Amino acid sequence: NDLLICCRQLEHDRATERKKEVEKFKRLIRDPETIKHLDRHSDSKQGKYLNWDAVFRFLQKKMQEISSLVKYFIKCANRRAPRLKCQELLNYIMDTVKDGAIYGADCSNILLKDILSVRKYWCEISQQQWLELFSVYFRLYLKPSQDVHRVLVARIIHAVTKGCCSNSKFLDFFSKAIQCARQEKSSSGLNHILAALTIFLKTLAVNFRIRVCELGDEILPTLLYIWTQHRLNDSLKEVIIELFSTKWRSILYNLYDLLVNEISFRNIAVKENLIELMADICHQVFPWLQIATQLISKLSPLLMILSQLLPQQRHGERTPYVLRCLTEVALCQDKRSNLESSQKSDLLKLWNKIWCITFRGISSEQIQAENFGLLGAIIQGSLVEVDREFWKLFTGSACRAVCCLTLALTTSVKMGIEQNMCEVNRIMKWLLFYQLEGDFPHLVLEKILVSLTMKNCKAAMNFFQSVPECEHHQKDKEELSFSEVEELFLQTTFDKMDFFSVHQNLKESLDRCLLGLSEQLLNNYSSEITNSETLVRCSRLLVGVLGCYCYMGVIAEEEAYKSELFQKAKSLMQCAGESITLFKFDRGEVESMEDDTNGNLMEVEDQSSMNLFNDYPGESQSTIGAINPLAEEYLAADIRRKLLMLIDSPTKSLHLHMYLMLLKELPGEEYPLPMEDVLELLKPLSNVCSLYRRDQDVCKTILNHVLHVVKNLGQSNMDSENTRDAQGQFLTVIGAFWHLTKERKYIFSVRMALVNCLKTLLEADPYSKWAILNVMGKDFPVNEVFTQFLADNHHQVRMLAAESIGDSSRLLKALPLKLQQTAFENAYLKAQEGMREMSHSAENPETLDEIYNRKSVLLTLIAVVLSCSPICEKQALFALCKSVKENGHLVKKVLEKVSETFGYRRLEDFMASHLDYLVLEWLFILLNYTNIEDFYRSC
């Protein structure tokens, strides 16, 4: 990288063609940068820095510059291992500034995409300057846009980079103006606009007008196919911002509905998607019952509109009896349809069943007779597959003989028949139907319902004997060629065990699962093409059954631990295979999932982790699980992903060393990993799983405290500089530290940690109310000395004062979160409740938002306690607040007037409090005169 670059420079100092010199450099940079030339990384950095100046001198010339750029791109491609991200960004900025220009940009689009990929890969360098480049690119691609295809891709890449890293109003206005002046192609701009709208801090204050203008421009002129998704996303965002101007939004919704009705196989799927979008948006926005009835009364498009109106309303609500009876009459009329397009008919039947289930909207009349008649008429011709399940669901909803005979005849399907039997369950013929049907708790529930008769055990014994004969007959092929037969036999054995108790286990097969596991281990040891296929099939079958059920599942696991000889053999084989395979952010996860071998290894590791969790032979597996920590510690990207997946998955004795070493091992990789990737979420789950049993009376307490200090240092570095994604992890860590133990574990300044969490919440305001409520709930259950509650109340008051002390709307919004947090803390506490109530009543002057939310406050108080008890508590709190104000005349009168305004009363009904205040202050004829003026006969 150094000697080759020096030779290339000495050869091409004349700048004649720079071809042979570049070829010699590309040929000789291999070994010189491989073994040693001079600090290979810095050598390549200096070589790139010198090549930049060489290209500048060569350009100081259009075709020659293009050839030099192509040669530099080829050299960078041959040098796929890059370094000096800052120098790369500087070179990219220089190329963008240099930009005839249209052809140059079209040629450099490849280098721009390569730089965008390099940024998405190594954004851990803390660039913090991609926003300026994205804005410059959007401004350059704004007037003529320099393109119609590459400009959209560049804008999308810039928006993705900005969203990954961390003004927009001008860009949105320019995009709206362009969409109104010309066509709306290149929907990448609309996607970037939607991403910027849903980026962060969406208040719909000024963006609402821009969104309305864009919607109007897209409704008037439009020529695009993918723009429909962006329009639907914008409509959903507007509906969510409106119902968590109004006339303009209603007009836009009506125009969109009219356009959808005018637009009205692939066309069927397109119409279904457009309906699922538009009807959902209309239900979220909205009155609509009349429009729905008119559209139903007003034939593929009509049937599609009817099916859309039915499922949308059924998922939305249970609207008035008028619309209910209209829909019932419509269904009774359409019951005699031609049954064409059975999918729409089944959807309409499911919607009618859901409406009949949610029929508690009108008075209980005799309208159910028509529904019962329609159900009977449908059951008279229900010889279908999906229609039978729809009729069964409708009958179950109506209930929540002829029907029993029909159910028995249908049972004599896998999921549909099971659902029908479960709905019917909510003699000799029943036993015969059960035997004909028989010839993850759903199987256990069906077995319990079948055995609830407490008789006919001979039929079950004969069925089990017939299944063992078929299993023994199919084992001849399952052991040789058939691979799914082993999984089927394992599932049958699990279902039989789900129904000491070793009698049935030894009776049924006593060998099927063990033989299947042995064959799978032998195939994995052979490791051929079909062998790996069967191994992947067996791994999927094993991952299918990973959980732990009730007592039935416990008995099944006991039988498994008893017959676990072959299970431990297969586990050792899988461990050997995983070791052999190891020996050989979102991008890393995608690269790990794109490999079939890596996916199979991950499935085997997940199965092993599930087995270890179920265990935490059978008893001998504890030693193997304990020895597995050495293999886990001994086990770049794929290895790290496997270690993370293993760490993400009594045992505390060995854990106090295994996880203690794993946490230190994870920090070394976390040195470069420390970029705020999605891995922070997986790390909190592992930390919570490891912290189940911590702070023990052993030497591992020092390692636990060291890990906690490392986590605290990481949280401090995040509070210094991070993103909003770390807020949830910080809140979870704070809650864990609060709920862990007493002051012995809270010696890490839990009060200061909560104060810092509240400060970060008031600063960023991402999901701040949830974090505040979690902190309040954690403080309330641990409060047992009455001093921590007062300290937390004072800290919350100080945080609210700091938040209170353009930006006026944001300040008022932040003050509402603090008021809600104080209200939640009051509803949680008992004495701090009255303390915070008096504090809010005193600060009511600047707390107009609290005076407005007093309605919901009183609603919550009446939901918690009775009305008379809340009134008495409020009177006691008002007396306490008046006493506090008197202790620290005019202020007391102002507080009393504020309390009377918050309530519904004049300056009266408080004779006891008035007499107490008089005996306190006067012991003053002014108070007596005021009382006489407020109410006569006061002497």
Partner: protein
């Protein structure tokens, strides 16, 4: 007889006792958030 078996019970042992949306959660914060806090309390 099946009504007793169909009755919903508790979860399993600790191995199983433990067990857009973000846009709705952000839009809830603050009448909906105070209502949710009061319902949880």
């Amino acid at each position: 007889p099946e009504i007793v078996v169909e009755l919903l019970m508790t979860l399993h042992e600790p191995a199983n006792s433990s067990a857009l949306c973000d846009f709705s959660g952000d839009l809830d914060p603050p009448p909906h958030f105070p209502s949710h806090v009061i319902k949880a309390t």
